[PDB]
């Protein structure tokens, strides 16, 4: 797929889902994350959070607000 717009943490953390910017999946909300962002929340690479369970994806959105 097409590369996807970045937006900071804190708009992806304080915004109501149906208020996110155009383009913005509220169920993939790491995925808008800059990779500084990525890796400052997650301490770890997409690919590897990607290949993680989904229970374990979810718990570790779930402490940061993310999920």
């Not at 304080?14 to 990779?35: H, Q």
Request: charged share 30%.
């Amino acid at each position: 797929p097409t590369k996807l717009e970045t937006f900071p943490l804190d708009v992806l953390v304080n915004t109501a889902a149906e208020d996110l910017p155009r383009g913005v999946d509220p169920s993939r909300k790491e995925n808008f994350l800059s990779d500084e962002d990525f890796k400052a929340v997650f301490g770890m690479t997409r690919s590897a959070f990607a290949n993680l369970p989904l229970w374990k994806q979810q718990n570790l959105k779930k402490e940061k607000g993310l999920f």
